Write a protein that binds this ligand. Structure first.
Ligand SMILES: Nc1ncnc2c1ncn2[C@@H]1O[C@H](COP(=O)(O)OP(=O)(O)O)[C@@H](O)[C@H]1O
Ligand SMILES: Nc1ncnc2c1ncn2[C@@H]1O[C@H](COP(=O)(O)OP(=O)(O)O)[C@@H](O)[C@H]1O
Ligand SMILES: Nc1ncnc2c1ncn2[C@@H]1O[C@H](COP(=O)(O)OP(=O)(O)O)[C@@H](O)[C@H]1O
Ligand SMILES: [Mg+2]
Ligand SMILES: [Mg+2]
Ligand SMILES: [Mg+2]
Lengths: 528, 260, 532, 52, 172
């Protein structure tokens, strides 16, 4: 290569082409997969990441760990992207997708090094993934009875399986029942914003509770608030979006008077406007008043005089949850405060929870929202508990959409690997090697489970392969018993769509990585 | 790392320890009497247990090797022009004197070589000298014409080991150089290690001494060093058997029994 | 807690770094394997340019930092020293073995089991090679040597001209042949003086039926061609005599200074007279010759060469029958030079080779000697021809010493892989994986050859493995053991019939050295790097 | 190397207790010849117990 | 403000890593400072690591000289090249002052530097040779000037001749 006084690209452009860059891309993918490798399974371990500001994030979630990793490698970013995709569409399996993709790339690396054309590998991956998805859909177990008790049990088992890998796995039955109960009360859309999650420092995990209603923190009470009663036995709730305090009528309003009588009339008119709003609220029959906009001290004292509870500056989502639980309507004008626009709950009370004051709306019979109040010894403890409960909630929602379950613990992947190997034994032979490599790479998850648990991976792998070969579909890794067992009878259940999405995303990532032959990096502009 | 070659190394270590000490009435083993020679090349399987001694020094008398029925002689004086301990000068004021100087030097060197040869010696070891030349080219030529292997640059600290191995008594003056001070050996040959250096082996000695030498071969230096350390560990274990002859089971049994 | 002033790596990290270093060293030279391989250019920091295909030279010239890479480089150097050929295959095999063993270790297989499996696989591979894949060279004749030389010179700058270079190599090696005690025919390579001189094409390279000196006559008055040469080899300088350190000249009678000064040079004059009086024609000395002695040789019409290399002088003395004299001292304390110490040659000429002159001692008697004058386009080309020629000479020496050869082109590797993957099922429970990985690693050679040839490596190696499996299973298909790779056409081919051989010692030593290097690296699981 | 004495003496430890353990391994090598790693591990475990 | 007997005690042995790292860095700068101080003040009044380890290495019996330059430098460089062609045994080399980072006075008033090293010590420190040598004198003039002080050392093959120890043996 010559200096060539006039150059084609910008000076400093870096270009990598050929087999070596593909091998380097595969190695980078393996490096990324290693960073979340040990977080998989009930024996998985958490990872702690410190940012530049010094904040520490402790998480067992693969997607969160990958997000906190500041990857810059163009090929490595695909694994993070597919982890984000799996989190978005499913919510669980973010650790499995990266491992599967990296194992695919590792298995096909020797064939790449020996000059195999990438298109053949891509076609083999597409065929194998299609066959595996069809097999998963075919052998997935579903019950067409719509029995409430067994469907509830299926939801609870799926929640426990999705939860039995986190720091709350000791109380996995308790939190699983809480999560299933919370999800069942969502109405039709299962919107995540309808499940409030409040984290309160202090207290054990068993002290965490689910509220059949809405609960939120106290919001900067004004003077005279402590004179209000803090418990009602059948209150009517006025959900408002109104600023109840003395203020200018309008920002651009101007008052022009030339008589002291008019001055007194103006001040009395302002006071009368405020008192008329408060009087309308009072004769609306409501005992609890909530508002997005601030509620002034004058209004607070007025409500205290009438023995009512008031709370201004309530967050928008909390008022939405209160409206959907008590069954009222958020009002921007108080002129027509009819009976139907007033919320209603059986019991309202303010109670102290770990050094904080919380307002409780319990006893709602037709509530369509929830409120998780999580307790723990550190803010990261509550954060990880919230992440785990989010995973469980997503799993339960997906199970509600379609109750198609497959046994976990790597049993499904053993069945898929056996089926794929059997299929590959009946083709010419160029695709046979690649499909066999795909089937072998499908064994990564149970092997990783055994490695994390401290087992001997080879013996468990051999036993699982022998068990699946001669008959047996749901035989996977049993962590506690140091051996293998029928995971379906052990209630290690997984929605089939989770593994379907995992396989699809891993295959797409592997094909995209393999299809790239050259990498070009333009010099950075405005480095600052 | 030599666990694979143990089947060859362990009998070698046992034989090396047994051949250097008396099996009866022995309380310790002097491991410095077992010389370890590290030669690059080959594999660990090429390790040897030569009974005599191997000298890394090359043969100055090129063209003659593999002396049979050798009569090895070890000298500690120099075969060069006469030179007293006192500072000495030879002043010449005539051309006849100038010719007689080198004539008499040649005669003296020839006399020394003839005196060495008359004893029946055929392999000569010369101790390393740093003050004056130990082996001059004229002396080397005279020894070559009489068919005597010449080996110079023998280390001073190696004299004791060589004398113990062969039985040669060191000679520091030609007056005391007699046949009774030579060490008879079966064979003394210089052997090439497959193009990876040359070694000189003196195997087979009448009345052999209580010394053995182990030649260590390996692909790279690191494995040679580790093999030497492991062989030393084995020799130390056999020494521990020599003194306080008591044996216990391994495998962590003594530790667990002690704990209980 | 350790408080050690240095960096520490433990577990998977250090193993992965070692394997990466070994794989990088392998990938450095993987592009110069087989006849379709291509050479590389090495440029120093001062602009010196080296073009070579030899793996050992490439690894020696490079700067290497990682200890495992150093291990591989020294492995290549040892393979070159002990065999002379296969310096790239040994490195590639060792790196592949290390990679597969590390993969097994990552599969939670203990490294001791992998090491035991590797040892068993190496022993069984050596046994199978010695028992089945060797070909005796007694019934093949000179064609076996020619084919071995041609195979060794493939992938080199003298590949296409092999039809001529192999003849040259075989003739030289057979010329330097000698027998020793116990009747072992020994071939002392490095006795063939390889002379380089740019100019005319390679086909004009000359094989000298004698010896060649890279030096000229001291004086321009001496004749530059003597027919009946009586070569006198000396190991002492011929100049004015000077007294030693212990001798001093002190003059008290001034009349003797002239006699002293005359005798000073008359000593050397009379030594030269004694040397010439016996009929000597060519005088070679390792030391220097001053002006008056050169004139003395000029007046007698005799050659005189100074500063002759010691090894060249020894070779000339051995070939011509002369004996080197470090001094003119007999056993009666006199100066003499008998005619018995004179070697003889059929002709000694100073030939001109591309604006430079060298001395050709042609057709020495009592012993046959050979030398090669290599003609190339420039200096780098001549150096590469010299390296390839040395490799070919070493291969021919190995073939002549040990009379067993094996088929080339990856046939041995494929047969060994099939046999080892069949044999691994017989012994052990965890060692079987190690032996299977050894068999798989042995397949890196044909794969690299196919990749270099830009052929379908997968299909070609699959066909080779199928052929060798059929050979091993069917006992009436033993003829398929020789099925190698035809890189020109990218098809399997009977390499034994095609004339592609190589010494068995090359494969045996490569396997042993690679196995030992892989075992040495595999024991490492912790690194401490103290700061300087 | 796998020899305990060689490993200990090949790396500078910079701590007086570690240096005394290195000397202990050297003494064990002088007296016995092997077991150099075992004696150091025994001393470390003994001091571990001493902490409690 | 008391306790003058601090007796830091465990401190230095507990933070010895950083102390030794700083000591190593300071010593690494120290060899460079010692090497550069041999030129400044000592003779001026009357990569750097490459230069350092080039001076440290090689045999003490070979005279090695270095030249300090900034971009008649070209004429002296040509004369130095001619001397290198005439004295192959010597290892003439040059290095920029900015790479060494010498003093500003040396850069501004001592551009032509003829530094000669023999075994790690300065046997010749010819600096600012403009006055006593000239501006356009040829290579022979420089050779004579350097040989007058006894500092510089006192056939042609075709191209090359160089290539086990068994040279040749015809013995049966
Ligand atoms: N009780 C159990 N026994 C064995 N394996 C389990 C059990 N519970 C979960 N697993 C396995 O753990 C894996 C999920 O691990 P986890 O890190 O929680 O989520 P992800 O799917 O994102 O890795 C599943 O593949 C499942 O097979
Ligand atoms: N004409 C040929 N046809 C097929 N294979 C060959 C031929 N010549 C050499 N080979 C093979 O190519 C391989 C590489 O040899 P090469 O790399 O040149 O030797 P080295 O390893 O000493 O550099 C050898 O193992 C040999 O079997
Ligand atoms: N085949 C074996 N089976 C069980 N234990 C063994 C075996 N070989 C050696 N050991 C044990 O390993 C321990 C360590 O020995 P070694 O590593 O050779 O020297 P060191 O005692 O210095 O570490 C010994 O105490 C011995 O009891
Ligand atoms: Mg999960
Ligand atoms: Mg070759
Ligand atoms: Mg031990």
């Amino acid at each position: 290569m010559m200096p060539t006084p006039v150059i084609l690209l910008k000076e400093g452009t870096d270009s990598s082409q050929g087999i070596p860059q593909l091998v380097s891309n595969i190695s980078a993918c393996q490096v990324i997969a290693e960073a979340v490798r040990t977080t998989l399974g009930p024996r998985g371990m958490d990872k702690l990441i410190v940012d530049g500001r010094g904040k520490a994030t402790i998480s067992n979630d693969g997607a969160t760990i990958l997000k906190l990793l500041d990857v810059v490698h163009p090929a490595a970013k695909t694994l993070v992207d597919i982890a984000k995709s799996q989190d978005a569409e499913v919510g669980d399996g973010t650790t499995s997708v990266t491992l599967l993709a990296a194992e695919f790339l590792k298995q096909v690396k020797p064939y790449v090094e020996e000059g195999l054309h990438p298109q053949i590998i891509i076609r083999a991956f597409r065929t194998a993934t299609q066959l595996a998805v069809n097999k998963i859909k075919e052998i997935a177990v579903t019950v067409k009875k719509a029995d409430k008790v067994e469907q509830r049990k299926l939801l609870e088992k799926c929640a426990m399986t999705a939860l039995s890998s986190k720091l709350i796995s000791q109380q996995k039955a308790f939190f699983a029942k809480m999560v299933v109960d919370a999800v069942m009360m969502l109405d039709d859309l299962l919107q995540l914003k309808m499940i409030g999650i409040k984290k309160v420092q202090g207290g054990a995990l068993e002290d965490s509770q689910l509220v059949a209603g809405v609960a939120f923190k106290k919001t900067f009470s004004y003077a005279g608030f402590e004179m209000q009663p803090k418990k009602y036995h059948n209150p009517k709730i006025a959900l408002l979006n109104v600023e109840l305090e003395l203020k200018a009528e309008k920002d651009n309003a101007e008052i022009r008077v030339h008589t002291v009588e008019d001055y007194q009339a103006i001040v009395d008119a302002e006071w009368n406007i405020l008192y008329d709003k408060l009087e309308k609220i009072h004769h609306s029959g409501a005992k609890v008043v909530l508002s997005k906009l601030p509620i002034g001290d004058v209004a607070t004292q007025y409500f205290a005089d009438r023995d009512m509870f008031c709370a201004g500056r309530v967050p928008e989502e909390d008022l939405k949850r209160t409206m959907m639980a008590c069954g009222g309507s958020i009002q921007t004008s108080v002129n027509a405060l009819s009976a139907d626009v007033l919320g209603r709950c059986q019991v309202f009370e303010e109670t102290q929870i770990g050094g904080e004051r919380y307002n409780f709306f319990t006893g709602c019979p037709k509530a369509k929202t929830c409120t998780f109040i999580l307790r723990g010894g550190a803010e990261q403890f509550m954060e990880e508990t919230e992440r785990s409960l989010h995973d469980a909630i997503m799993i339960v929602r997906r199970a509600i959409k379609n109750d198609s379950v497959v046994a976990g613990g790597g049993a499904i992947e053993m069945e898929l690997s056996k089926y794929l190997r059997d299929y590959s034994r009946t083709i010419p032979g160029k695709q046979q090697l690649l499909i066999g490599a795909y089937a072998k790479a499908l064994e990564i998850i149970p092997r990783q489970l055994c490695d994390n648990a401290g087992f001997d991976a080879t013996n468990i792998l051999n036993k699982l392969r022998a068990r699946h070969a001669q008959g047996g579909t749901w035989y996977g890794v049993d962590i506690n018993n140091e051996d293998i067992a029928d995971n379906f009878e052990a209630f290690v259940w997984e929605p089939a769509m989770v593994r379907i999405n995992a396989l699809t995303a891993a295959s797409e990532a592997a094909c995209l990585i393999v299809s790239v032959d050259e990498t070009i990096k333009n010099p950075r502009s405005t480095v600052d | 790392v030599v666990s694979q070659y143990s089947s060859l190394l362990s009998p070698m270590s046992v034989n090396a320890v047994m051949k250097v000490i008396d099996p009866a009435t022995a309380t310790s083993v002097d491991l410095r009497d077992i010389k370890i020679v590290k030669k690059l090349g080959g594999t660990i399987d090429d390790c040897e247990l030569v009974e005599g001694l191997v000298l890394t020094q090359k043969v100055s008398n090129s063209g003659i090797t593999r002396v049979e029925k050798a009569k090895i002689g070890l000298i500690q004086f120099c075969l060069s022009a006469p030179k007293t301990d006192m500072d000495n000068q030879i002043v010449v004021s005539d051309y006849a004197q100038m010719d007689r100087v080198l004539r008499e030097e040649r005669a003296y060197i020839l006399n020394l070589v003839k005196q060495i040869k008359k004893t029946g010696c055929n392999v000569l070891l010369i101790q390393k000298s740093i003050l004056r030349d130990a082996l001059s080219d004229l002396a080397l030529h005279f020894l070559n014409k009489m068919k005597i292997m010449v080996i110079k640059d023998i280390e001073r600290e190696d004299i004791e080991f060589i004398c113990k191995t062969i039985g040669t008594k060191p000679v520091a003056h030609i007056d005391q150089f007699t046949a009774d001070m030579l060490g008879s050996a079966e064979l003394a040959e210089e052997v090439n290690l497959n193009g990876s250096g040359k070694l000189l082996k003196i195997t087979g000695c009448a009345s052999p001494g209580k010394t053995v030498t182990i030649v260590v071969r390996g692909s790279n230096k690191l494995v040679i060093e580790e093999a030497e350390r492991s062989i030393h560990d084995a020799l130390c274990v056999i020494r521990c058997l020599v003194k306080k002859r008591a044996l216990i089971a391994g495998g962590g049994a003594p530790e667990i029994e002690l704990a209980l | 807690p350790l408080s050690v002033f240095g960096d520490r790596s433990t577990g998977e990290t250090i193993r992965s770094q070692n394997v990466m270093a070994a794989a990088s060293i392998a990938n450095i030279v993987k592009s110069s394997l087989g006849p379709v391989g291509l050479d590389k250019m090495l440029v120093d920091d001062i602009g010196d340019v080296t073009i070579t295909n030899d793996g050992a030279t490439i690894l020696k010239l490079l700067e290497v930092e990682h200890p495992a890479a150093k291990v591989l480089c020294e492995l290549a150097d040892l393979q070159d020293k002990e065999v002379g050929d296969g310096t790239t295959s040994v490195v590639i095999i060792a790196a592949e073995l290390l990679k597969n063993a590390d993969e097994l270790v990552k599969q939670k297989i203990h490294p001791t089991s992998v090491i035991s499996g590797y040892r068993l696989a190496c022993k069984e591979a050596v046994r199978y090679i010695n028992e089945n894949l060797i070909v005796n060279t007694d019934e093949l004749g000179r064609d076996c040597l020619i084919n071995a030389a041609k195979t060794s010179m493939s992938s080199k700058i003298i590949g296409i001209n092999g039809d001529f270079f192999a003849n040259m190599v075989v003739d030289a090696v057979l010329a330097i042949k000698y027998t020793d005690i116990r009747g072992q025919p020994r071939y002392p390579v490095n006795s063939v003086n390889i002379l380089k001189a740019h100019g005319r094409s390679q086909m004009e390279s000359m094989l000298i039926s004698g010896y060649a000196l890279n030096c000229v006559v001291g004086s321009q008055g001496m004749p530059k061609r003597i027919v009946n040469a009586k070569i006198a080899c000396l190991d002492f300088s011929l100049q004015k005599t000077k007294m030693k350190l212990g001798v001093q000249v002190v003059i008290t009678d001034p009349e003797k200074l002239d006699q002293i000064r005359q005798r000073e040079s008359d000593i050397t004059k009379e030594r030269i007279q004694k040397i010439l009086a016996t009929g000597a024609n060519v005088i070679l000395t390792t030391g220097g010759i001053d002006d008056m002695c050169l004139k003395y040789f000029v007046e007698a019409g005799a050659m005189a060469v100074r500063r002759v290399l010691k090894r060249d002088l020894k070779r000339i003395a051995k070939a011509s029958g002369a004996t080197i004299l470090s001094t003119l001292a007999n056993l009666e304390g006199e100066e003499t030079f008998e005619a018995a110490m004179l070697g003889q040659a059929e002709e000694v000429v100073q030939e001109r080779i591309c604006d430079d002159e060298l001395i050709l001692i042609k057709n020495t008697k009592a012993r046959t000697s050979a030398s090669i004058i290599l003609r190339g386009a420039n200096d780098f080309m001549c150096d590469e021809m010299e390296r390839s020629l040395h490799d070919a000479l070493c291969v021919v020496k190995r073939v002549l010493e040990s009379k067993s050869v094996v088929p080339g082109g990856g046939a041995v590797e494929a047969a060994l892989s099939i046999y080892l993957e069949n044999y691994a099922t017989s012994m052990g429970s965890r060692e079987q994986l190690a032996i299977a990985e050894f068999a798989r690693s042995l397949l890196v050679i044909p794969n690299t050859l196919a990749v270099n040839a830009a052929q379908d490596s997968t299909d070609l190696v699959a066909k080779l493995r199928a052929f060798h499996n059929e050979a091993q299973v069917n006992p009436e298909r033993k003829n398929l053991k020789w099925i190698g790779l035809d890189l020109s056409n990218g098809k399997p081919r009977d390499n034994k019939q095609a004339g592609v051989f190589e010494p068995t010692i090359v494969k045996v030593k490569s396997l042993k050295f690679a196995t030992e290097a892989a075992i040495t690296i595999l024991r490492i699981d912790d690194l401490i790097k103290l700061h300087p | 190397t796998n020899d305990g004495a060689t490993i200990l003496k090949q790396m500078q430890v910079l701590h007086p207790a570690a240096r005394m353990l290195v000397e202990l391994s050297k003494a064990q090598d002088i007296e016995a010849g092997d077991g150099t790693t075992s004696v150091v591990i025994i001393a470390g475990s003994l001091l571990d117990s001493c902490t409690k | 403000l008391a306790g003058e007997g601090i007796s830091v005690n465990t401190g230095p042995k507990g933070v010895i890593n950083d102390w030794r790292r700083f000591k190593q860095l300071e010593t690494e700068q120290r060899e460079e400072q010692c090497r550069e101080m041999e030129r400044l003040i000592k003779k001026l009044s009357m990569s750097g690591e490459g230069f350092l380890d080039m001076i440290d290495k090689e045999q003490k019996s070979i005279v090695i000289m270095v030249h300090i330059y900034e971009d008649g430098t070209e004429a002296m460089n040509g004369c130095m090249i001619c001397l290198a062609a005439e004295y192959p045994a010597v290892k003439f080399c040059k290095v920029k002052s900015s790479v060494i980072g010498a003093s500003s006075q040396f850069t501004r008033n001592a551009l032509p530097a003829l530094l000669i090293y023999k075994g790690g010590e300065l046997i010749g420190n010819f600096v600012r040779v403009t006055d006593q040598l000239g501006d356009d004198f040829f290579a022979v003039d420089l050779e004579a000037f350097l040989q007058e002080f006894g500092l510089l050392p006192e056939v042609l093959t075709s191209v090359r001749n160089s290539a086990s120890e068994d040279s040749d043996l015809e013995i049966d």
